[PDB]
Design a binder for this molecule. Structure first.
Ligand SMILES: OC[C@H]1O[C@@H](O)[C@H](O)[C@@H](O)[C@H]1O
Ligand SMILES: [Cl-]
Ligand SMILES: [Hg+2]
Ligand SMILES: [Hg+2]
Ligand SMILES: [Hg+2]
Ligand SMILES: [Hg+2]
Ligand SMILES: [Hg+2]
Ligand SMILES: [Hg+2]
Length: 263
């Protein structure tokens, strides 16, 4: 059950005036592709806050990567789901090495040394790499049952150029005449149920490959792409959400650089 939104004053959407004329804002299966200018964050914030939405952000920090946690968490505090309930889950082999980062109210961090917990603790799960930093708003506009993010190096490439696993012997195999987009494995998520379905599917597919003596060209990412090809995401995030400015600069098509790689 969802309560009614309160009175709100904002610019009237214009039916005869497209959001963007330079990019695709909706997929062929009617899933929005999230770009700056396509959403009114005030309306979305209201919708998700009225549902007391809790977002879980999971990251794995092993070995040398624990060094990226401080910047990752500090910037997440400034740009990730601000105003909403957030629960960080840091999976690490060095619990004592996790930095003591100051969190805003309604935000929590759990250290898990290296389930049902997720189903009872959060509504959505967002899975990202730790060697990154938030530079701009990353909010509820990304929440949906299942989402993938366009890889910054292939958003303008033809499917033939996509680095999908091309060997039929692999469970992640995708032929040259198939494929919608090339999603990057560094940023995906959705409802806890959908994320667990995806991780379960990929885990089993990888085991099958292992038994067959084969390893997907881009490992987990190859399997992620096969899954999202067969189970269309309900939202697709634009490269604004996964960028590398030193490697790719700042093209006009990107009005904002929200989550980027750390040099
Ligand atoms: O072609 C796929 C590869 O693209 C690279 O730019 C990226 O650093 C790799 O992690 C992998 O995603
Ligand atoms: Cl994950
Ligand atoms: Hg618009
Ligand atoms: Hg995850
Ligand atoms: Hg993760
Ligand atoms: Hg998969
Ligand atoms: Hg996997
Ligand atoms: Hg996967």
């Amino acid at each position: 059950f969802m309560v009614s939104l309160p009175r709100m004053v904002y610019p009237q959407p214009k039916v005869l005036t497209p959001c963007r004329k330079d990019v695709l804002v909706v997929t062929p299966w009617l899933a929005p592709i999230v770009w700056e200018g396509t959403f009114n964050i005030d309306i979305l914030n209201e919708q998700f806050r009225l549902q007391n939405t809790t977002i879980g952000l999971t990251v794995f920090a092993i070995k040398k990567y624990v060094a990226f946690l401080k910047l990752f968490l500090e910037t997440a505090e400034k740009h990730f789901m601000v105003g909403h309930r957030v629960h960080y889950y840091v999976f690490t082999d060095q619990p004592a090495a996790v930095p003591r980062v100051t969190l805003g109210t309604g935000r929590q961090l759990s250290v898990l040394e290296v389930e049902r917990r997720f189903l009872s603790e959060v509504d959505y799960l967002v899975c990202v790499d730790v060697d990154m930093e938030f530079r701009d708003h990353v909010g509820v506009e990304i929440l949906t049952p299942l989402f993938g993010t366009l890889h910054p190096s292939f958003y303008g490439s033809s499917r033939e150029a996509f680095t999908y696993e091309r060997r039929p012997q692999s469970q992640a195999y995708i032929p040259k005449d198939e494929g919608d987009f090339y999603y990057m494995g560094a940023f995906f998520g959705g409802s806890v149920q959908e994320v667990q379905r995806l991780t379960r599917a990929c885990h089993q597919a990888m085991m099958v490959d292992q038994a067959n003596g084969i390893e997907a060209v881009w490992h987990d990412e190859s399997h992620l792409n096969k899954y999202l090809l067969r189970h269309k995401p309900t939202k697709v995030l634009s490269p604004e959400y996964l960028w590398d400015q030193q490697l790719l600069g700042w093209p006009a098509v990107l009005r904002k650089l929200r989550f980027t790689a750390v040099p």
